Amino acid sequence: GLASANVDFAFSLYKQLVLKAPDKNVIFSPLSISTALAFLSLGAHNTTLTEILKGLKFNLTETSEAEIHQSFQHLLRTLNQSSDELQLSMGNAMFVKEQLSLLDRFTEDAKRLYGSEAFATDFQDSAAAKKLINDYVKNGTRGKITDLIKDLDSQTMMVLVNYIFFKAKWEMPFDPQDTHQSRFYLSKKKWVMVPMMSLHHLTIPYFRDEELSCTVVELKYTGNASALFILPDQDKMEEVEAMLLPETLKRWRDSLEFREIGELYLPKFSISRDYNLNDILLQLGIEEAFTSKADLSGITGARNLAVSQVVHKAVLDVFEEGTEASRTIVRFNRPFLMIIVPTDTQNIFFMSKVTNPKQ
Amino acid sequence: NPLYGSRLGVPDTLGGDPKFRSLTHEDHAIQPQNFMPGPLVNSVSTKEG
Amino acid sequence: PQPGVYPPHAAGHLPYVLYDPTATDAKQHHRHGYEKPEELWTAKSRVHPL
Amino acid sequence: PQPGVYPPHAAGHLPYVLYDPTATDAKQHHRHGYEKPEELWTAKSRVHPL
Amino acid sequence: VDHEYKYPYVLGQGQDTLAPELPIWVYFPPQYAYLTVGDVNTQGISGDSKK
Amino acid sequence: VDHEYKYPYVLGQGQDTLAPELPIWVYFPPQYAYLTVGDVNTQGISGDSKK
Amino acid sequence: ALTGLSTGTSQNTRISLRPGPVSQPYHHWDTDKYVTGINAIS
């Protein structure tokens, strides 16, 4: 039951995202936000837990928070059990005010279960706090993510960091020698020169949704996951988004039949954006933790801590051979959706809306 | 001018999306030419025949 | 009507105008707000019969 | 450069141009190949300081 | 009379549109038509193309 | 001298750019700047807009 | 090494003839593609 609520929360979060930016490129990992939100819940008490679990569509009458955690930890264990062919590295964490002593029990629990590590942070002289947090996030990853935090206010109380990066190879890798410079149409008469990679004489899961006015194709990775590319027709993206629901995603996944597509064209883009989730989570349904009344007793036990900044950066690469590259015609020269899901179960690893691959 | 490179660029990586690299003063063999050489019709020596 | 004489397109935002790269989300920050078109301004936009 | 004098946009394909509606992708075949722009051709494209 | 050559010129392309070679025959002048440039678009799934 | 009014006119707006009121003071002419039209673009999530 | 139209006494000893004659292009836009010639100067 965790996966369905994960997908619902993902869709609500994406809807809020587009509401804050109708045409800008959208990229975020629902899995990363899910683990960050659950880990924040790990340190909550009283009605803050109830609100943070009203978020992500959780029926507390049937599902208890301990079992939610255990399912999350099992998900992380399975993800880390994967071999080198596909890897998804997640490193979200929490930076606590150093003037308040952090709970040793909470740090041990986070390290053992959610694997996140927290420490006292010298938030005094926030200019140096920016430097130290950027240095930590750069040392954590291999170098995929830098300048994650744009700014820090004076006497910022605590900050939540969430980063993520995929690394997987296509089942049908694109040919770099066939990557052609073409046009991507922003609108009816607006286009940008962007490189697109091409395939031919290949069969993939494909579905033309005649009652939804879109086209869904599935590109499988060498691992147990895959990606779904969603191409609405001209001036029909908003209608697709409006009727875009998990009940739509289930029908799309169960209506994926193999088709011998003639040529497939896909923009060569590497989206990377940072997102501050204060207002967006406030509109989502989690609001008490942000107004100096979080009752975050699992963090220190003093109810002195509340969330001030939640910054998430989802970096994901779409090249010829996947990340860090060395009849029926499908051309993605229009703004399109992209949802990364497993074949076994429905759970959104990554979700993106691409409107300008030059950006 | 042998001392100065060209402001134009030449292909470095080939294929459908050719990246272009600028010219230095070391690579004189890739200097672009304003005018082409004259035609040659079987202009070969007696050692070929 | 004849085809419009379009101003040339740039890789990031617009060419030959001094903009603020921080305001834009484009990735051509190296030019520091003043950009060149990625296609050389070629003219020959208006067409006539043979 | 001054803003280009864009010919106005039609609801489907291009305005003031006779074309084959069957060769188009849009369902705006009701005007039978000849169309007028959805936005009235307004001019005032080039701008000057005040 | 297109003195300014403002319209496409289709004479002299070897078309079966000439005046009759015998004076005893009646000329039926050909209907004027011309070819122009355009954008080639593929007809979606069917794979056909049209300018 | 902008005789043809080619450049934007910023005089006559009540700005603190005036010459000194007494002849015993040195005038520091203001730096020229103007405001022009543009497209309002949102800065990501925050909703802040820049022209 | 050297690519495109070139003239010389051997493969190693050549001079490039880029961008070629003015009678031919070295970059344009195809039906759905930007095509760049091997004798293109940027």
Swiss-Prot record, chain A:
Interacts with DNAJC1. Belongs to the serpin family. The keyword Glycoprotein applies. Although its physiological function is unclear, it can inhibit neutrophil cathepsin G and mast cell chymase, both of which can convert angiotensin-1 to the active angiotensin-2. Its main location: secreted. Alpha-1-antichymotrypsin can bind DNA. It holds the Pfam family Serpin. Keywords: Acute phase, Glycoprotein, Protease inhibitor, Secreted, Serine protease inhibitor, Signal. Glycans are attached at residues 46, 59, 80, 139, 224. N- and O-glycosylated. PANTHER family: ALPHA-1-ANTICHYMOTRYPSIN, SERINE PROTEASE INHIBITOR, SERPIN. This is Alpha-1-antichymotrypsin. It is found in: Secreted. One of its GO terms (molecular function) is DNA binding. Plasma. Synthesized in the liver. Like the related alpha-1-antitrypsin, its concentration increases in the acute phase of inflammation or infection. Found in the amyloid plaques from the hippocampus of Alzheimer disease brains. The reactive center loop (RCL) extends out from the body of the protein and directs binding to the target protease. The protease cleaves the serpin at the reactive site within the RCL, establishing a covalent linkage between the carboxyl group of the serpin reactive site and the serine hydroxyl of the protease. The resulting inactive serpin-protease complex is highly stable. It comes from the Eukaryota. The keyword Oxidoreductase does not apply. GO terms for biological process: acute-phase response; inflammatory response; maintenance of gastrointestinal epithelium; regulation of lipid metabolic process; response to cytokine. One of its GO terms (cellular component) is collagen-containing extracellular matrix.
